[PDB]
Every structure is written in structure tokens, then in C-alpha cells.
Amino acid sequence: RKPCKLMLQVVKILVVTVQLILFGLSNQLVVTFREENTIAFRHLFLLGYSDGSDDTFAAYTQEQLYQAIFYAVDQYLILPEISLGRYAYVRGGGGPWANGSALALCQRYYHRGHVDPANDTFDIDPRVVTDCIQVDPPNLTLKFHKLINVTIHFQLKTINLQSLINNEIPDCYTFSILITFDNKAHSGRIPIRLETKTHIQECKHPSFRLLFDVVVILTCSLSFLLCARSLLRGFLLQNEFVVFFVNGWYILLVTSDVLTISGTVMKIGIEAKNLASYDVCSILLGTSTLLVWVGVIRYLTFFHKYNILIATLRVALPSVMRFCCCVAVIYLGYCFCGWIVLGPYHVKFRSLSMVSECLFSLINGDDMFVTFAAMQAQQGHSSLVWLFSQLYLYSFISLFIYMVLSLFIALITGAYDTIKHPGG
Amino acid sequence: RKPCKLMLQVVKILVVTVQLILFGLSNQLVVTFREENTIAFRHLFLLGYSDGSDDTFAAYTQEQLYQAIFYAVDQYLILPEISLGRYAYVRGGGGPWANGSALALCQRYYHRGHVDPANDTFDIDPRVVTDCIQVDPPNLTLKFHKLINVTIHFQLKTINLQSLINNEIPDCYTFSILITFDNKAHSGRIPIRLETKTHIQECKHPSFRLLFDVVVILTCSLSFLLCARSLLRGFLLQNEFVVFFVNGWYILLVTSDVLTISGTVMKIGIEAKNLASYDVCSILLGTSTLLVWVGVIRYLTFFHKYNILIATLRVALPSVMRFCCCVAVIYLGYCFCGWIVLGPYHVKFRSLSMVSECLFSLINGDDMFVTFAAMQAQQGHSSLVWLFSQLYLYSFISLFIYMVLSLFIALITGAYDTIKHPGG
Amino acid sequence: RKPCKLMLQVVKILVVTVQLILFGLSNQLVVTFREENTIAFRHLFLLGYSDGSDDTFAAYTQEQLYQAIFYAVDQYLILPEISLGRYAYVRGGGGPWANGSALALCQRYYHRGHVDPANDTFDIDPRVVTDCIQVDPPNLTLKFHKLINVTIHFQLKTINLQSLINNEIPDCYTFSILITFDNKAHSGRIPIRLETKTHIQECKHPSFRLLFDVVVILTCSLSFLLCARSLLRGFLLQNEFVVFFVNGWYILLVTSDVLTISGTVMKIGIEAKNLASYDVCSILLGTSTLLVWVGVIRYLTFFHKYNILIATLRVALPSVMRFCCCVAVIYLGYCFCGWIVLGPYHVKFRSLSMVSECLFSLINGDDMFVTFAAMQAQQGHSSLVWLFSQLYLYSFISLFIYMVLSLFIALITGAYDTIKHPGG
Amino acid sequence: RKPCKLMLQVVKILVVTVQLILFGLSNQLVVTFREENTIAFRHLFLLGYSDGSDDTFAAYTQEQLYQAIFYAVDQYLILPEISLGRYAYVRGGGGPWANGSALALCQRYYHRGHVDPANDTFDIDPRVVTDCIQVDPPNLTLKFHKLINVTIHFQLKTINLQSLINNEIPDCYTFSILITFDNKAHSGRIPIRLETKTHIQECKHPSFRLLFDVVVILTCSLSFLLCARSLLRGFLLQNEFVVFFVNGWYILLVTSDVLTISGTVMKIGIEAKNLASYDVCSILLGTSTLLVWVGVIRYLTFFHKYNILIATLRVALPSVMRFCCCVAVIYLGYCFCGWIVLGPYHVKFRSLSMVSECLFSLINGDDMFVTFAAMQAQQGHSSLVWLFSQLYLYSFISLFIYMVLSLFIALITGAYDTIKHPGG
């Protein structure tokens, strides 16, 4: 009945999460399609594309510069002469207007740019100048001190008949591609990278599942308004217990009111702004759905056969909260250590991110024999700190490895005192 | 005697499992031979075969297409002129008949195939047309829009004198090889892959171990009919305990009746359908054999010196079953999370398989510093979700790592209450 | 008040550690700049530079020698003709004087060097002779028995306008580079390596944050003199408790007097000797800062809500000290085993460092399936010791894996006896 | 005194183990020298040597054969013309006599060798014929069906002046090198491998540390005869306790009598048969030395401050022995499973070795996300067994991961019942 209304929320949450794991299957195949489109674009344009090579694509030489300039330039001339598909480079004037290239070959530079590195001085209007060449889809050179960056923006339509395999009509995706040499280091080494966007419009010559997603929205509303109303029972009850864990009899109701509302907001409203807001509101639903599993079990123990371990879940929070506080304080000072040493020879200690990632290496054994063995093997410097790397690392390995089991295990004996309470 | 009949089942199970680890040694060497034949075929035909390269073998260019067409075509002309062995390409007309090639060079295409990607439309009889060239073991071109796939089927016998090293006569293995270019993406990138089958017939010019396998079948029958009869004792006893763990005094008897029957069914009956049904019925025996080890120990404690830990095995099932239920519910919502985020930047969250594989990364430290460190390092997108990747990942690392020891360890204190029962 | 003076030490320690994580952010970006300068130098000079290749750069041939000699020699002639920046090779006479090269091409050799390896004898004045060629920034050959080593020292200024991106003036960094062929093995294989130093002087044409670092020094002094004085309270109290854990009420005061003094000594005094003494005194501060987190928590439990786990921290030291002693004794004999076997086929057992690194592999699962699986897979020798590698390794895996949990877990029951004391 | 005699054994064992870690340092540097000699030989002879490439060095073509034959043949002609050292190829007639080559170019073949693989038959005197060419250090072809194997044996002296860096005289090492093409597969793919031995004789023109090793032998004798005599005290005591743990008061005495005897037997007697018997008797000493650490601690607790955890070490053996028996029985049936499935798609399940190595993957997390994720990713076959690979693997991961902590942890509560005994 009314717990029937709740479990109908739960299994309907199971079913709509079927619908979401379904929709995410559908998008995951489509993102297979997007990612396939992406990898295909990278190799094809890749005059010189190598795997991992992307990690190092840079002209050491100016001839190493201008030739690839010629190379892509030949790409832009004779792409229709060459392509394994059909690509459609229409006017697409960018990125400043006036008028169209299609390949707009631009280049940023200093504006005032006196730089005597032999003199250690400059007179730089740190202003930059940028110049572009228009190359009608059917040669110049520049100062090696002079440039700031350089780019080749052009766009090429293509149409999606592989969706004919997906039983769908050929649609339109235009690839807008800027090719940037980036001279921002100015250090004689210059990476190129290539960017593109894809306009997914339909084909010019141009829903029982969509209705299913909508009806699932309706039942989860039947759920979430049960949640406002059982919370209304609960808030009249808040008014009454004031006037006179578990944790989620109201709280899951608002939070699954939240999960249902976030699925609704991804569907139509923010879904006219599809891509990312989809991803985030789905962020919200999955907490609805993880929540769906947990409270289904919470409705579903039958005491668990009698609530002893459910009693076990609570009281260690009162001490292990202070415990987690102290252990985090340790984690912070050690992250401070990781920030400190990590610069001198490290990638692992490399950011607040990297200090967090070594925290993966602390409790997880993936980081251990690699980091302390390799940093023991000393890329490093300064053999006192060759001593110091092992000393901090083996120092940092030992204490937390000795201690975390006692955090949980002083727990494991004291909820054995709460199981001294409970095991009877 | 009768427990002598049972332990004779056990050691005879040990001995026949010797015979199976033996037979699997024999097949494992033979599968070394099959796998060696496989690797040899791959390199040899591999006009362009590279290690891992298989991961990317694709013509970006149409000249990249037709040349390899020429390349393998030259393979098919002059393979006898070239081979490091002797290969035998006889008539072998395939894969449609009429008549023989041997290299049957086929190519699938659209049938109705109007496709204006510049127009975003098509008129496709989504029909495909396929054309083949017959090249007698002793040049054409096609529309780059037009093809659907392409293949080169031919077969080449060879004979097995390396079994002369195995003290066996030279037998016959014909390699039937289709070379497929697959244009199913139609995305200007086109992978080739090569397939072959091997007919293992005997050489034209052409068993104490086999009898040993049969006699082992007979003794395990002496076992399994003891199992029907001690289960007959047991089912008369089921009739009596109705009329008036351990777990396996009957149950292993049917299951080892099962293990023995599965070994028997792999031997002759399904073994005239050898390869896979072999693998599966051996699937069944190994549970017989793992079972053989366990119940040998179960017959073999002598109480263990007194059944205390055997008493320890049972009662946590009554609570840790509900516990495993809840912990699995957590695993499912987190797998839901893994399905959700895993698409945006991931290989690890990549299927229900991939969500299962990250479940290896959860409890096993192989997945941790790699996944959360690398996804922290953000292939990714959208630095809010650059935040979100660490937040979900470090969120997902923390709780289960804190908690699973308490599942087993609330166990470790409550069968310390069942050892409060038992440790006296 | 006075505990206000202490917590002001703590949060001011938090804030100055903000200032240090800040300053280390600043240096970490600058060391990004140094490391970027380093990687750029390596590739650019790298006539033949490959990734990892550095692991094997060696002329097998004498032509493999002298050509690269020509190659770098061409580098030294026409570097201004070639460079992607502007590099400044001024007089820079080195490394012996008289006068300048800039590329000083030197070569060490034996002095008395009779060596009949066909005779197994020598007449070596083990004296070495070294000869150098002066190549004005705008060919000879030597005995392959004869050389000891060879080098090409020259220096090239450059100026730092990328700091213009850091909003800083172009400064001066001179790269002094010796190119050494090292013939010390004399074994027909000869590695080259290239070294450089960088003089960071300012540009010729040429501080609210620095004042902030100084004022932080002042407040931490207000802290550390509170530490001398509360230790003065404490040492008058030492005089009184003599006359009549916690651990750090005095001890952190001297040690954070230490942390504050080490930050001060890195700032100005040893900071006129900047680089390394910076790194080490920062070594000292981070213990101040890890200490800052811990004693903030120690001041911050409010009993923790009542000091039970704080009581839990102590008494196991009285037994687990002897326990850690014994377990270390095990670790030493096994490290002795690692020293013993590790030579015959190993990199992992490779030093006292390498024996320590396998100690990472012992408790951490990063080293296990790799080492015992690969050394099981037997690079190795001598299949008795093919037996022995698995036998020692699987022997060495088993005992400590069985035992360390009982060290902590005989702990986990005996501070369950100290929690037999405490859990009431 | 007499425990002084024992601790003098212990610290003298510490000191001689210093002497052994020393001697193993000396041999480890020398094995650095041997391994350096090895790597140098591999690259230098390596007409085509690549890293890892060794994993695949094989002629697919017969021209791929005979050319490398020419290549090494040119090696043998003009090695003195080419070498980065001086190499000494003297008469060295091998490997059959009569007389000398130096490069003895041999080739094994079938003797009777009729093989119609087109006929699936043969007439093989499985006899092999071998033919050799003598190439005086200053062209033929053979049947591609015909060969069995082929080899190029020659030897080249060289002399060790790098020991001049070790302050030692140039000695003599002759490298005897057979180059074998091995046609044993006969499968059209043919690997070459090259072997060499090195004769370490002294240079023709041609010990306080050795005396230190001898005197250490003498003191450990003073120890081991104390061991025979305190065991004589102990065996008179065996006679008395018959007439009327700890574990090692006698037992370490014989075993360290063993460790001392094994060091002695490696020194002189078997040490005139140096290399391997050195390695094995050192195998024996390290157990002496691990033993030296343990019994030093056993002599060294001072009760440990009171023998409670020493009491903790014993009684779980009485149950956990039966426990380890059962858990090993599980390990065997699962190793049986690993033998069973491991063939169909596996390297990890690859031998009894490989089944043991997956046992590293079971308890160690190095094997988990790789094996079950990659075998989940299905090299594999037969998607039922695509199901089966995850099912066995995730099946095999779960139980032992759930259970081993309870083995040690039913231990951790029952020596909490033995600490129910002991924690008072």
C-alpha cells in the first residue's frame, strides 16, 4: 500500500535506472560514435600523427616549422583530392570575419618586440600582432624571434551514413579545425596541436522510447510527491515531536525528490542545452540510484534478520569521526611533505592533485614498489636527499600502514565493545 | 571399507585429476602447438604484421587500400615461390561455390547507394552488392563511397612433421583464409583483418594412455554409483527423517556423480564433437576436483583436531548473507556511478564488464593509483568534472575501503561471539 | 589567551604553511621552468636524442664515435645558423684555462699504455693524457686502445623572455655544456653524455610577497619564543617535578622552535646560499607542519570526546616495540636472502636499496605477481635454482603475509585487553 | 660467558654476515662485471640486436636466412677490422675436432628425409646430417625442407684491463660463441640465437681479505663446536629427560653448525668448483643468517619484557595447521581450475609455475585488475566462456578474499581466546 507506494518508488527506481543505464548505454554507444569520430579525425588530419607521439609533436627547426605548414597547406588544397570519405569545406569564415578562407592561416606575434637576449633587455610593446592568409580550397615566412603563435582555421562538413547502420538517416557534422602552432614558451621548441568542433545538424532530406522516458518521469513524480507528502507526514511529525538513525525516511525523500528532479531537469528544460547538463543531472540521478539500492535494502532486511549489524553501523561514528579527523591531519602534513619533496624529482608528487594521487599510493599498493623503488633508484639529486627520498618515503609508508588497521580495528574491538553491547 | 570406498573415490579422484592435469598438460602442449601454428600464420601472412600493430592496421588512403590488395595478391600468386615451408593451395572453392579461386577476392558494396553527404541525403537500396575475382594460384579498382566490405578467401594445406618431433606421423592441416577489408565504419578509415581455419585431418600415409583414461572412467563410476547408493542410503534416510551442515554427504555425491558424468560426457559422447564440449565438461570436472580436495579435507580433519573452526564456518552466513546483500547493493549503485561517469573519459568504466573490472580496482590496488591518478590527471573534460572525477573516485575509494574489513571484522568479533560461544 | 597563544601558533602555522605550500607552488612552477629548460636543452642538443634512448646512447663503432664528434662539431660551428632561439656562446674559457674555445674538445687517454690483451699483459703508466681542440664558434682522430675519455666543453648564454609571460624581465642563463664520451669501461662500448650548467644572472637592463614571508617569520618567532617560555615554564616544572604521554607540550615547542628556526635559516642566512639549503630547511619546516596538523588535533579533540583511543595509542609500544624489533630481525635476514639470491638473476634485489625496494614488494602487492611470477618465469639460471627462485620467493611471501596482521592483530586483541581495560 | 659464547656466535654471525654481504657485494660488482660483459657481447655481436627484439629474432625468408649467414660471416672475416676492442680468435677447434675454423659453420638436417606434406607422408630416416664450413679468420646454400639446425661456432679471446680500474692486472677471457639457427619447429619460422662461454684465465704477465674470510671460518667453528657441545649438553639432556618451544636451543645449533659448515664448504672444498656451489652453500649460510637475526632476538627479548606474544606464537599452529591444510586444498582445486581454463586464452595460467603465479595474483593485487579485467576483455573465445572467464575469475577472487582474513582472524579472536588465556 503506502510502503507499497515506497517500494514502487524503489523498483520503479530500479526500472528507470534500467532506463538510465539503458540511456547511458545509448549515449555510450553514441559516445563510442563521437569518440570514433574523434580518433578518426585525429589520425586523418595527422600529417605525422603517431600514438603517444602527441606527447611530443614539436618542430625543433624552423624548417621543421614551415614544412608542416606546407604539409597541412597541401592538406587544405587537395583534401577533396585525397580523402577516404567526402569532406565538405564551405565558406565558414572564421574566426574573425571578412570573409572566409576556408583555411584561415593566422599567426600571432609580439607587437613591440625588441628582445636582445644577447643584451638581456627588450623594448616590447607586449602587444602581439597576428597575420592571416586566405587559401581558397580549390607561401610566406616569418621571424623566429617574432611570432607568438600561429593557426590555420578551416571547417569541413561531412555527413553520417554510418547511422544508416544504426538505421538512421545521414545527418550533418561540420568539423571546424584550427591548427595552432603555439610559440608561448618561445624557447626554440614549439608544439603544434589541432582542434576541431563538430556541428551536428540533421540531414537536409529528413518515438516510443522517448515517450517511455517521459512516463518514467511521471511515475518518479508519483514517488517524489509521495516524498513531499510522507515528508509532509514527517514535517507535521517534526512539528509534533517538537510539540511533544534510520536517516533517510525523510532525507532520502527529499534526496530522491532530488534524484527525480535532476532526471527531470536533464530531460527537457536544461536538456534543450543538452550535453553537459545532461552529464551533471545524471550525476544527481546516480546518487538517487545508489540511494535506490541502499534504501531498497534498508526497507528490505526484515530486520536483516534482526538489526544487529545495523546497530553496528552507528556508534563508531562518535569516535571514528574524531579518529578520521586526526588521520586526515596526518594525511595533510604528509601531503605537505609530498608537496615539499615532490618538486625536486617527481611526477607523482606533482600537484594538489599529485599529492592526492600519492595518497592513492599510500593505501593502495599500486604506488609503492614503483614510487619508493624508482625514487629510491634516484632520478633525483644530492645523495643526502638520495638518502632523504627513501627516508621520507619509507618513513611515510610505515606509520599509516601500521596504523589504519588499528583505526578500523580499535574500531573492530570497540564495536566489539559496542558488540560487547551487541553480541549478546 | 565403505569410507574406504569414499576415500578411494577421493584418492582416485586425486589420481584421475592427475590424469586430467595430465591430459590438460597434453592438450596444453598441443595448444602450444595450435597457438604456435597461430602465431606463425599471423606473422607469415602478415604483409605488414607488427606486434600490437594489429591494434591499428588500417588504410587511411585508397592507395593504402589497393596496394595491400596488390600485396596479398602477390602473396597468392607466388606463395609457393616464397614460403619457408611448403603450403598447399588446392581447389577449395569458396565461400560461395562456382568454382574455385583459390584466392576468391570478393567485395561487398551498397546496392542502391545514392549518398550526398554534401547533400545530407541518400537514395540507398541498403542492399549491398559483392563482386569477386578468381586468381588461379599459378587488377581492378572500386568506388570509395561504393564499398561495404571486401575479402580474399583462399585455402592452403600444410602437413605436420613437427609431430615427428612429437614422435607422430605428418598429418594434414589446411588453412582457409579470408582476408577482409571491412568498410563498415565507412568513415575513411578501414581496417583489414585476416581469418583462417585449419582442417586437422590425418596424413594419408597412416593406445595404452587412451585405455588408462577409460579405466579411470570406470573407477569414478565405482565412486559415482557408490554416490547414487549412499545417496540411496541418504534418500531412504530422507524418507526416514521425514518419517521420523556438513552439506555434501549427499550433495557432493550427486555433484561428483556430476563431475564423473561430465568427464564421461567429454570422453566419448560429446567427445566425437571434441573441442569445446571437452572444455566445458572439463569445466564440470574441475568442480569435481576442487570438490575432491575439499571433501578429502572434510573427511580428513580427524575433527581437525576438534571441529571448532568448522563450527566457525557456519553462523556468520546468517548475518553476513544480509551483509553481502547490502554490500552488493552498494556495489551496484557504484557500478551505476561507474556506468554514469565512465563514458565521458574512460576505458576502465567501459562496459558492464568494465564496471565489473573497476570492481577489481576497488578492492584490488592494481586499479587505484592508475585510475584515480590518471583520471585525476584528466584526459577527461570540463574542470568542474575535473573536480568530479577525483570527487567520485576518491569518494568511491574511501567508503568501501573503510567498510569491508568491518563486514568481515564485525564478523571477526561476532564469530568472536560465536567464538564467545566457541572459544571456550 | 595563552592557549590562545598556542592555537595562534597553530593557525599561524597553518597560514605560514599556506605560505610555504604557496612558496613551493612558486618554486614548483619555477622548477617546472627549470625542468622545462632542462628538457628543452636535452632535445635540442640531442643530435640523436630519443626518449629512453638515453638509456643506451653508445657508439659500437669508432665511426660511430668520430661521426657524432663531427655532428656535435657541426653543432658548435653553426649553432647560430640553426637555433630555434638565440644562443650566446661567448669566450667562456674552460675548463682548464688558456684561453677559450668555446667548444673545448678534450680527450683523456692512458699515459703509459702498453696493453697486449693478445698478450694478457701491459706496461701502463696508468697516467692518462688528455688533448683538446679549440674550435672558434664562427678534424682529428685517436687510438681506440688509447683513449680514457673525451669531452667537448662550451657555454652558450640565452635570455629569459618567457618570464615576460610571468610578467618578469628577460634575465640571463648561460648553459655550460661538456660533451663527454666516457671510455672508462674500455670494453668497446662507449656511452656519450652531455652536461650543462645554467648561470642565472639578471638581465642587464634591470616586493609585497617577500615582506609577507618576513612577517610570517616574525609571528612564528612569537610562537617559538612562547615555546622557549612555556618550555621555561616546563623546565622550571622539570626543576619542580624533580624537586618534588602527551609528549610534545615541551617537545613540539623545541621542535617547532626547530621548524620555525629552519624556515628562518632557509630565508636569509643559508638563503644567500639558496638552492639546496632551501630544500633541506624546508625539510625541517614540513616536520614543523605535519607537526602543526597533529598538535592542532591534539589541542583539538575536546578529549576527542573523551581520550579512549588516545589512551589506545600508547601501551602497545611496550610490547610492539619488542615486536617490531623481532619483525625487523626477520626483515634483515630476508634482506640478507635478497642480497644473496638477488645477484644471480635480478634487478629487484640489486642494492641495499634494492633489498629495501623488494621490502616494498613484500608488504605491497606491486612487487609480487611481477617479481615472483617473472623470476618464476626464469631469466635466471640452473633449474635447481629455477626451483630455488620460486622456493625462496614463495617462501618469503608466505610467512610475513601470514604474520604481520597478527603483529598488529595480537595488538588488535591485546589493546582489546588494554581495551579490556579501556572499552568499559 | 657461555651465553657469552652464544652471543659471540651471534654477533660474530652478524660480523661474518657482514663479511658475506661484503663478499656478495664483491661478487655482485663482479657480476655487474660479468653482466656487463654479457650485455656488451650481446649488442656487439648483435648483427641486428634490438632490445626485446630478442623475443622475436627469426627469418621468415630463406633470404632472411642466408643473408644473416653472410652477415655474421662478414663478422668472422673482418672482426679485427671492426672491433671497438681487440678480440683474439685463436685456433679453438670445435666443437667436433679436426681441426679449427675458427668459425665452424655447421648445419644439421634430416638424414632420411622424404616429406610430402602435399602427400601427408614421409620416408624419414629421422637421422639428421650436419655439415660444417671452415672459415679461417683472416658461400653455400641448403634445402629449406632439408635442415634440422645450423650453427657457427668460433671463439675469441679478449683481456680485462677494466680490472686495471679495479686495480687488478689484465686477465684473459675467451668468448666461445656458437651461432645457431634452430630449425626444430620446421614451421617456416626460424629463430637464431647466439651462445658464448668465457674462459677466465689469468693474464700471462702475472690477500689480507682472504685471510679475514678464513679467520671468520675459525670463529664460526668456535661457535659450531660450542653447538656440538651444547648439543652434547643437550643430548646428554635428551638421555636424561628420557631417563627421567623454544625450538632451536639445540636445533639452531645443528642448523648453524649447518650454516657454518655450508660457508666452510663454499670456501675451499667445493670452492675449487667455485661458481654454483658457492651460490648454493651461500643458500645455506643465509638461513644461518636469517637464523642469526631471529635467535639473536630470541636470546634478546629479556622476556620481550615478558613472553606474552612469544606465548602468542604457538597455539594457533595446533588449529591453523589444519586450517592451512584446508586452505591449501582450496588452493589446489583452484590451481586445478587455473590449469583447466588457463590454456584456452592465457599466459597467466601457463604452467604449474603459471598456476602458482596466479596464486600471487590471488592474494596480491598486482594480478587482479590486469588478469580479470583483461581476460574479461576477452582475448579468449566462445562468449559462453566469455561469460565463463569472468565467472571463474570473479568467482575465484571472491571466496579467498572473503576468507583468508577469517583464517588469520578466527585466529585473531582465538588467540584472543589464547589471549583470553594470555591477555590477563
C258 in reach of chain A (CB within 8 A)? no
If one counts every other C-beta atom within 10 angstroms of the C-beta of residue D51, the result is 11
Please name the helix (run of DSSP H) or strand (run of DSSP E) that holds residue C291, with its range, or none.
helix C274-300
Retrieve residue B144's grid coordinates. 570509395
C263 in reach of chain A (CB within 8 A)? no
C304 in reach of chain D (CB within 8 A)? no
So where are chain C's domains? 2-29+208-300, 46-201, 315-414
* CB contact set of B63 (below 8 Å; sequence gap of 6+): none
Give B132-170 as a 3 state SS string.
EEEECCCCCCCCCCCEEEEEEEEEEEEECHHHHCCCCCC
Scanning A346-365 for CB atoms below 8 A from D yields 364-365
Residue at grid coordinates 577525483: B390
Residues of D in contact with A368 (CB under 8 A): none
DSSP reduced 3-state for D131: strand
Task: With both helix axes pointing from N to C terminus, report the angle between D352-363 and D317-342 in degrees, rounded to the nearest 10.
Answer: 120
Taking Cα atoms as reference points, which of B304, B309, B298 lies closest to residue B246?
Answer: B298
Angstrom distances, CA of residue D226 to CA of C138, D6, D11: 80, 8, 15
Give A319-355 as a 3 state SS string.
HHHHHHHHHHHHHHHHHHHHHHHHCCCCCCCCCHHHH
Task: With both helix axes pointing from N to C terminus, report the angle between A2-45 and A251-264 in degrees, rounded to the nearest 10.
Answer: 40
Question: What is the Cα–Cα distance from D84 to D98, expressed in whole angstroms?
Answer: 31
Q: How far from chain centre, in Å, is Cα B372?
A: 29
Identify the residue among A28, A46, A284, A407 best suited for mutation to test binding to B, counting B beta carbons within 10 A and taking the highest: A28
CB of A180 closer than 8 Å to CB of A192: yes
Min Cα–Cα distance to chain D from A278, Å? 29
Question: What is the Cα–Cα distance from C260 to C285, expressed in whole angstroms?
Answer: 7
Residues of B in contact with D120 (CB under 8 A): 159, 170-172, 202-206
Residue at grid coordinates 627421567: D244
D390 in reach of chain B (CB within 8 A)? yes
* DSSP tally for chain A: helices H, then strands E: 10, 8
Residues of A in contact with C166 (CB under 8 A): none
D373 in reach of chain B (CB within 8 A)? yes
Q: In one letter, which amino acid is B100?
A: G
DSSP reduced 3-state for D405: helix
CB of D111 closer than 8 Å to CB of D129: yes
Retrieve residue D265's grid coordinates. 664448504
Q: How far from chain centre, in Å, is Cα D251?
A: 29
A17, A43, A51: residue with CB nearest B60: A43
A126 in reach of chain C (CB within 8 A)? yes
Q: Between chain A and chain B, how many beta carbons pairs sit less than 8 Å apart?
A: 216
CB of D157 closer than 8 Å to CB of C118: yes
The strand pairing partners of D143, in sequence order, are none
* CB contact set of D300 (below 8 Å; sequence gap of 6+): C325
Q: Between chain C and chain D, how many beta carbons pairs sit less than 8 Å apart?
A: 215
A21 in reach of chain B (CB within 8 A)? yes
Taking Cα atoms as reference points, which of C396, C309, C134, D216 lies closest to residue A327?
Answer: C309
Tell me the resolution in Å: 5.8
Min Cα–Cα distance to chain D from A366, Å? 8
CB of A53 closer than 8 Å to CB of B56: no
Quote the Cα angle for D248-D250-D255, to 5°: 70
HSE of A308, CA atoms in CB hemisphere, 13 A: 21
Min Cα–Cα distance to chain A from B343, Å? 6
* CB contact set of A325 (below 8 Å; sequence gap of 6+): C297, C300
Min Cα–Cα distance to chain D from C303, Å? 27
Using CB atoms within 10 Å of the CB of residue D98, give its burial: 0 to 12 exposed, 13 to 18 middle, 19+ buried: exposed
Min Cα–Cα distance to chain B from C346, Å? 23
CB of A108 closer than 8 Å to CB of A132: no
Question: What is the Cα–Cα distance from C356 to C350, expressed in whole angstroms?
Answer: 9
D184, D318, D340: residue with CB nearest B165: D184
- What are the φ/ψ torsions at residue B205 (nearest 5 degrees)? -70, 100
**CA of D347: which chain B residue's CA is closest?**
B32
Question: In chain B, which residues are last before a break of more than 2.5 Å from C to the next N?
Answer: 138, 206, 244
B203 in reach of chain D (CB within 8 A)? yes
D369 in reach of chain B (CB within 8 A)? yes
The strand pairing partners of C122, in sequence order, are C115
Residues of B in contact with D380 (CB under 8 A): none
* CB contact set of A121 (below 8 Å; sequence gap of 6+): A114, C169, C170, C203, C204, C205, C206
Residues of A in contact with C159 (CB under 8 A): 115-120
B164, B289, B357: residue with CB nearest D373: B357
Render B40-64 in DSSP notation, one character per residue: HHHHHH-TT--TTGGGG-EESSHHH
Angstrom distances, CA of residue B69 to CA of B32, B37, B87, B158, C235: 32, 24, 21, 24, 91
Question: What is the Cα–Cα distance from A101 to A176, expressed in whole angstroms?
Answer: 12
HSE of D388, CA atoms in CB hemisphere, 13 A: 20
Min Cα–Cα distance to chain A from B323, Å? 8
Q: What share of chain A is helix, strand, coil (3-state, %, to 5)?
A: 55, 15, 30
CB of D94 closer than 8 Å to CB of D228: no
Instruction: Inspect the interface and report whether the beta carbons of B44 and D188 lie closer than 8 Å.
Output: yes
DSSP reduced 3-state for D50: coil
Identify the residue among A53, A142, A336 best suited for mutation to test binding to C, counting C beta carbons within 10 A and taking the highest: A336
Instruction: Inspect the interface and report whether the beta carbons of B121 and A365 lie closer than 8 Å.
Output: no
Residues of A in contact with D410 (CB under 8 A): none
Question: What is the Cα–Cα distance from C303 to C385, expressed in whole angstroms?
Answer: 58
Scanning B60-99 for CB atoms below 8 A from A yields 60-62
CB of A37 closer than 8 Å to CB of A173: yes
HSE of D119, CA atoms in CB hemisphere, 13 A: 7
DSSP reduced 3-state for D116: strand
Render C385-419 in DSSP notation, one character per residue: HHHHHHHHHHHHHHHHHHHHHHHHHHHHHHTTTTT
D188, D339, D376: residue with CB nearest B83: D188
Question: What is the Cα–Cα distance from C418 to D303, expressed in whole angstroms?
Answer: 19
Min Cα–Cα distance to chain A from C69, Å? 21
HSE of C1, CA atoms in CB hemisphere, 13 A: 0
Retrieve residue D411's grid coordinates. 585466529
